[PDB]
């Protein structure tokens, strides 16, 4: 068992990470995704995540989260307050997302950890000889 | 800002990501893009960049790319060899785009380590408060 996966954006992000993700690990891939549009609003997210969540259950879930501070990433936050096995990590690029979609980690606070060190160790400039 | 921006992906991802940047930050926020797709392989995301690379010529130039060691982060390095005052940072993430977008920074390798430190500031671990 493995934690539940979930990519939440502004608008089709998260979605495009994902078919992305599949390019390099195919089917592996496979999280849900929440993409709020400008109609949505805070509500609007609020019930796309909750529907999500209601689904799934008391389950261990990871959101990855486009970006702290964010009306999706803040939606996420607060949903940590039903769910207690929900954990969410902002500032999601593709080898956070190849890396979740991979990884054997059981536990859902080992994997946030892991795929933060992931994420940030991805971002580097590319120097040059 | 200075620099002209690219963001390179595979798929669309980069496209999305320049398109949520505009709704945050407003019409202002412009970059070329590179969509890799499954067709594309190394010469068509190659003949992809040099069309963007060419029309604009030998100005300071980053690309954003998806993630290190891939084909569109590949072929951004290699026109690093031909465009002397192109950069390159990988691991895009929506901070980063935001930056760089309203950046006033002119100077490239300036830019470049100012978004390396955003995107990796960007990512990190979320928790409500607990103060009840």
Same mark, same amino acid.
């Given at each position: 068992?493995?934690? =539940?996966?979930?990519?939440?954006s502004?608008? #089709?992000? *998260? ?9 390099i690990?195919?089917?592996? *891939? +496979? ?8 109609? +949505?609003?805070?509500?609007?997210? /609020?019930? =796309?995540?909750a529907?999500?969540? =209601? ?9 990855? *989260? ?13 949903a940590?307050?039903?769910?207690? /096995?929900? #954990? ?11 890396? *979740? ?7 859902? +606070? ?9 994420? /940030? ?5 590319? +120097?040059?000889?």
């Open positions: 068992m493995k934690p =539940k996966l979930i990519l939440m502004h608008g #089709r992000m *998260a979605e495009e990470t994902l078919a992305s993700t599949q390019m690990v195919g089917e592996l *891939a +496979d999280a849900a995704i929440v993409s709020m549009t400008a109609e +949505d609003g805070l509500s609007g997210t /609020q019930a =796309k995540l529907a999500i969540l =209601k689904e799934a259950g008391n389950v261990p879930t990871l959101v990855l *989260a486009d970006l702290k501070g964010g009306t999706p990433c803040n939606v996420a936050m607060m940590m307050g039903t769910y207690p /096995q929900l #954990r969410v990590v902002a500032g999601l690029n593709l080898a956070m997302a190849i890396e *979740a979609a991979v990884s054997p980690v059981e536990n859902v +606070d080992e994997l946030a950890a892991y795929l933060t060190q992931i994420g /940030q160790s991805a971002v580097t400039t590319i +120097d040059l000889p």
